[PDB]
Every structure is written in C-alpha cells, then in structure tokens.
Amino acid sequence: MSKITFPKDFIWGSATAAYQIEGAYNEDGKGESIWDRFSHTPGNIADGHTGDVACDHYHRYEEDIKIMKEIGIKSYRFSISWPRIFPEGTGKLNQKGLDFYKRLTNLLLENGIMPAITLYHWDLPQKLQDKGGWKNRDTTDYFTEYSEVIFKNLGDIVPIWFTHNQPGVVSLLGHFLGIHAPGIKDLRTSLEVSHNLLLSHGKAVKLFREMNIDAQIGIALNLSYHYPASEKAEDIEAAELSFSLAGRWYLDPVLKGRYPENALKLYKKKGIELSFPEDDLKLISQPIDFIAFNNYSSEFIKYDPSSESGFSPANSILEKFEKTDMGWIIYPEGLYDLLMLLDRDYGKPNIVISENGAAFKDEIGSNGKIEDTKRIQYLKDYLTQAHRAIQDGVNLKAYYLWSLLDNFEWAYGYNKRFGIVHVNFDTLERKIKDSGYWYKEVIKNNGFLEH
C-alpha cells in the first residue's frame, strides 16, 4: 500500500460547457448559435438529439451548485455563451444574458467555489457564421470585443480564464470533416480557421494584459501523446508528424510563436502553402500564465510509406487495450508521458488539466445508486499518473474532471455519459454517481490510497 497525496494547494475541479448543459436555447434574447443550427438539421446528431433543453442548467444552476458543494469541488470550469451576450455577435449587448453569468459567478463564490471561465466553447453566433465565421478575420476582433465585456464585468472575481477550448476540434471536425458545426468540409478553410482561432486568442490575451486583469489566463488545447509503433527512426518521425498535425499545430504557435515545420512541409506537399502576417505569430504567442489541455487517450502511429499522410494508426498495438464507451483506448501512462513532454519541451510551464474523464454505460441500480466502477478506475489510474509527473517535477497545478454532469456529447447527443452526476434527460433529475462520491473523498483527502 502507498498513500497518494497531491500538492498542498492543488486545485480539484470539474468542467462543463454552455451548449452541453444550459438549454434555454431561445430564451432571454439569446441569439442562435452555429450549434443550434447544426443540431436542428436532420442527420447531424445521433438520434435527432438537440441541445435545446440539455440539462436545463440555465434554470437549475442553483441545484447544480448545491451538488458541487456536496462533492466539494474547489473550482468549477464553465463556458459563457457568446450569443447570450451579443446575440448578433456584435452590436447591442444583451444585459439579461450578462446578468445570468454575473449571478452564476456570484453564487459560486458565495459557496466557496472558485470560478474558471472559458470564453469560447464552440457556440459561435450564427449571424457571424453568415458572414464567414472563423474564416473571416473580422471575427477575431468581434471575439475580443466580447471578451472585453466579460473581462470588465467578471475579470477581478474570476481567477482562471481560458480563451478557447479545443480550437483544433473546431477546425478539424467543424471545417474539414464537417461532422461538427458549422459543417464545413474544406482543408484550406479549416487551416485559415485554425489561424484565426489562434489569432483571437492572442488578441484576447493582449487585451487581458492591457486591462490589467488581476487573474491568470491561458488556453485549453486537445492534447495526446503520439507513441511511435517502434524505436525505428521512421516510426518516431511518423509519430512526430502525427503530433505536429494535431495538438502541436496549436501548441507550437502559442508557446513558441511558430507553426511546426514538419506539418507545414506536408501541407505544402498537398498543395497548401500558408501565408500569414509576421506579427500574427508574435500576437498568438503572447505570454500566458499557464498552458491547459484536455486529454483522454493516446495515439499509436506507424510509418505508412504508400499513404498520402505517410503515417497511420498502429492497429495491432491499439487492439491490445481496453476501451471506453467512446471506443478510445485506456492507457493511463500516456498522461504521464504527455505531462513530461510539456514540461520538457516548453520550459516547465505551469500546467492545467482542463478536462480528463471517461464515458461508460451507466445503470441506475435498484438502490438508486450508479455503481460506475469502470469510471472510478479510469479516473484513479489517470490521476495516479498525473501525480507521478508531479513527483518528477511537472508544474501541474489543477485537474478539472470532465464532466460534472451528463450532457450533450455533440454529434453523439445524449448517448455518451461523461458525468460524475447522472442526468435523466427526460425528467432533468440529477443523481450523484459513485464516481461523484469517490471524487468527493479524493478532494477531502487530497488524493487516495493505492493497494
């Protein structure tokens, strides 16, 4: 037996996103977002599910905060719905939308919970999409004007700020694969969108500094460790390319002020040679108080000479792993290896785990309990590896469990449950899962026992 104890001031949190939990999609003057439009189009979401009602958090936030206080989370990461603030993306401010998040933040503080705000978690106002969306560079200024309203109203009571959540998913799934809003399918557009997402991050950070906000700001990137299939140089180079086309396409601009050259080479080979102003990468790499990342699984990559990419997943390795209800492999060591790479490659930054969690099939037993043993095991195993990285010198400051509530899992709808709290989407009843009660004790004890 060994006792696992995290650092004295370690921040234990849980995370949600506005569109995934709030509902009230057309109430109090809120403007239509691209995810309203995407969800209302048949064939885009599993089972025709929508985020129209979701968890109805807009009306039940007081119950959800009381649940947060029972579990004892020290920080709550949520996102603000831009179209609740500016229904047209710019123009007239909707005070009613503002007052919602002002109230929500105030009750969180009154309940001893530290708020942590994501400014952009994919709900772009549809009016801005009608003018090109993130393909239009003007949208990066509209985002900064919206951030200024939030910074002015909440900046000096919210200690932790995330500009963007997973720009790489917005780019890849929303603008190349087209399976996320706004449903666009064009490689060049998705790369222009990637740049403008990053540029809006840099503009918001610059504004954050110029407003002298007494808080910390960062960005939340989707990151995984990409393992080479072997120690042969061809597989290492293949995994390096895979990473630079995924999370490192955003990591390197943010922390080093340059796109990865090996990924640029590939896009040039495909016929796409990118050209952005010199100062754009300066702006993108504004110093940030921490780097934050969402991690769930790991990749395993092999050299694939006859393919266009030059690499492919090492399926013979991947089939040895257990999988979650999402079909993702479970490999806890991948979180240690990822944390150690962040610490090694980027000058030992302060690091925040803005999301970690797992989806499993949930069952409400005859006792009313949800005995989600596999979810507990996932979290405990991944947290053990995060603790290991801390012992080896990584400046990991916070851990946000995805998610507080079962919610709208984008194109999967309500078919995938990530919560430590079960939500019945027909009755809106909340039931804390056994994983929620486990986390409650982890927080109280600042860790757990390993047998």
Ligand X SMILES: OC[C@H]1O[C@@H](O)[C@H](O)[C@@H](O)[C@@H]1O
Q: How far apart are CA 435 and CA 230, in angstroms?
A: 36
Q: How far apart are CA 14 and CA 103, in angstroms?
A: 19
Least separation in angstroms between residue 363's CB and ligand X is 20
Least separation in angstroms between residue 93's CB and ligand X is 26
From candidates 135, 409, 419, 433, binder to ligand X by CB under 6 A: 409
User: Would you say 22 or 409 has its CB closer to ligand X?
Assistant: 409
Residue 126 sits in the site that holds ligand X (CB under 6 A): no
Asked if residues 293 and 223 have their Cβ atoms less than 8 Å apart, the reply is yes
Residue 165 sits in the site that holds ligand X (CB under 6 A): yes
Q: How far apart are CA 370 and CA 286, in angstroms?
A: 44
From candidates 4, 11, 17, 421, binder to ligand X by CB under 6 A: 17
Least separation in angstroms between residue 418's CB and ligand X is 6
Asked if residues 283 and 206 have their Cβ atoms less than 8 Å apart, the reply is yes
User: Would you say 17 or 421 has its CB closer to ligand X?
Assistant: 17
Residue 294 sits in the site that holds ligand X (CB under 6 A): yes
Give the type of residue at 234: E
Q: 276 to each of 137, 395, 423, how far by Cα in Å? A: 11, 33, 45
Total residues contacting ligand X by CB under 6 A comes to: 10
**Site mask for ligand X (CB under 6 A), range 302-341, x = bound:** ----------------------------------------
Least separation in angstroms between residue 251's CB and ligand X is 15
**Number of neighbouring beta carbons within 10 Å of residue 436:** 26
Give the type of residue at 353: I
Q: How far apart are CA 120 and CA 68, in angstroms?
A: 23
Residue 355 sits in the site that holds ligand X (CB under 6 A): yes
User: Would you say 321 or 450 has its CB closer to ligand X?
Assistant: 321
Retrieve residue 405's tokens.
């509530």
Q: Which residue has the tokens 């609740």?
A: 84
Nearest to 423 by CA among 440, 405, 438, 411: 405
User: Would you say 143 or 303 has its CB closer to ligand X?
Assistant: 143
Q: Which residues contact 335 (CB under 8 A, 6 or more apart)?
A: 295, 356, 382, 385, 386, 389
User: Would you say 229 or 358 has its CB closer to ligand X?
Assistant: 358
Residue 406 sits in the site that holds ligand X (CB under 6 A): no
Residue 22 sits in the site that holds ligand X (CB under 6 A): no
From candidates 75, 144, 166, 171, binder to ligand X by CB under 6 A: 166
Least separation in angstroms between residue 35's CB and ligand X is 11
Residue 25 sits in the site that holds ligand X (CB under 6 A): no
Breaks following residues of the chain (C-to-N distance > 2.5 Å): none
User: Would you say 276 or 328 has its CB closer to ligand X?
Assistant: 328
From candidates 126, 222, 244, 286, binder to ligand X by CB under 6 A: 222
Q: Which residue has the tokens 């986390």?
A: 439
Least separation in angstroms between residue 435's CB and ligand X is 15
Q: How far apart are CA 356 and CA 373, in angstroms?
A: 16
From candidates 418, 438, 439, 448, binder to ligand X by CB under 6 A: 418
Nearest to 149 by CA among 217, 198, 101, 215: 101
Which residue's Cβ has the minimum distance to ligand X? 294
Q: How far apart are CA 421 and CA 204, in angstroms?
A: 33
Positions in the binding site for ligand X (CB under 6 A): 17, 20, 165-166, 222, 294, 355, 402, 409, 418
